[model samples]
Target: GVKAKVLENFLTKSRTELLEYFVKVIFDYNTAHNKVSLSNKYTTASVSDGLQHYRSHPQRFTYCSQVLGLHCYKNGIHYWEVELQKNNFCGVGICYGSMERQGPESRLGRNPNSWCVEWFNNKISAWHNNVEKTLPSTKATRVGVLLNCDHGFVIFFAVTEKVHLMYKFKVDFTEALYPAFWVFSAGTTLSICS
Candidate 1:
């Protein structure tokens, strides 16, 4: 009990300070939904009007137009950024590697295994396990994500010349998590910042 108590003192550091731990992760082609097109060495994804023609795979998403990252983390802290047009219904999130690969619950933030901040025309919201919380709209085109697995938390930021907190999730994660994404409109594009 005393050992667990010591962890209470491990607090999160400033968002800017997290920059040192920044990592570049790319989309996993195998896990992408058939209609989610990946390009630029898998660092970018966009919605395609026609099927992307990805061969059938058990790990690929079948319902939601989403994709998962090739990199995963189970411990320590990591940071990454994403740039997107934010044209319509799109989401950036993290999810357990074991999360459903297909079906309705597989969508980010719609199940216990994932958490994300979603963007709509001018509305923004945070979600986890089917619960949603509307957030203040941001005009920033770039977003930053900080994941502190050791402390069981992930924070999102609307990033521009300045960084603004968007939302965060503090959970008792049970497994390694993969970066996840979702896009709806035909021209919406998401790119993992290097």
Candidate 2:
């Protein structure tokens, strides 16, 4: 209770102010699922249209979801932002590095090892262990994740509003966690905020 209250106090800070002390991470191309291409700076992850023909192919990239993240966090209060160029279908959150890189478990929020607030079409939902909690849809294009590893909790915020809490996960992390992302919907794109 004390810890959550203390963390809530920090919410008083504006998103832009919080961004000042936030940690930055780029997309990990090597760890990314196939057909998921990374920008030259490794900051953006997008599905290549060239692979559109193989959309039906059951390859790694054939999965509607693509996973990407960098810089594993073992401890500390880390925050990062993800700006959705087009918020049709995308997920932003954190996950253990051991989280599967292929198959159903590989998708963020599909397994217990990860947590994410996802945007599907015009609906929003929070997911973990394949369980989902529908959240009121918001027009916020930029989402922020505040991971307090020491406190064993993480909070997702809608940057467009005055610190609107989107979702939060409280758990004792067993392994190093990475800033994970998943993007579906052909023209959608996600980029890490520096």
Candidate 3:
């Protein structure tokens, strides 16, 4: 053994450095699909086999296995992250509150009012208005989403050892956007890192 040079570990901020403005996003049970179960005080959304039978609300998602956040972002620079738990087939996105909740268009990334990044069997893709762009897969399990409302842009980051850009969307957002999530496969669970 003749190797004896080691660099000092001064450390770096990395993901922890992004603390300028963060939003503690929460799921809205009123907008959740019947097959999606809200756990941990609506902080975690997991897929279910049958209807949980909470109540018949007009804001409930009737056609898609999806849910929306309680807070409506209007104009701000906010950062948030989603922790993927058993996320084999799931989606993370944002949409307008006025988006159709009872029609097939209610699905994430299927309508013009929404944008999403989906993970399907290890494949990553971005979707908007029924169009898709295949993206490179990342080994990171946590995803960070940044919304710059004033500039009309959004960015998705795969938080590995550091935050890496997965996708970005620049649009003149006209309406208040709500955090949206979709889970279709069994056992797929998504949690907001609030």
Pick by TM-score: which candidate is best? 1
Consecutive 10-residue window with the lowest summed lDDT within model 1:
3-12
lDDT of 2 by residue, 1-194 (tens): 67777576656667766666588798765566655678859888886666522233322323435755657899877888889975558888888877776666678888998999998867899999999999987778989898888768888999875668888777878988888887775677888877
lDDT of each: 0.84, 0.77, 0.82
Candidate 3 residues lying further than 4 Å off, grouped into runs, are: 1-14
- lDDT ranking, best first: 1, 3, 2
Q: Across residues 1-194, which tens digit of lDDT does each residue of candidate 1 receive?
A: 44234233223345566688788898998999987998999898999989887898988999999999998999988889999885667899999988998789888999999999998767889999999999987678888888878767788888888667888777778999898999887888899987
C-alpha root-mean-square deviation, candidate 3: 8.8
lDDT of 3 at 175: 94
What residue pairs clash in candidate 3, if any at all? none
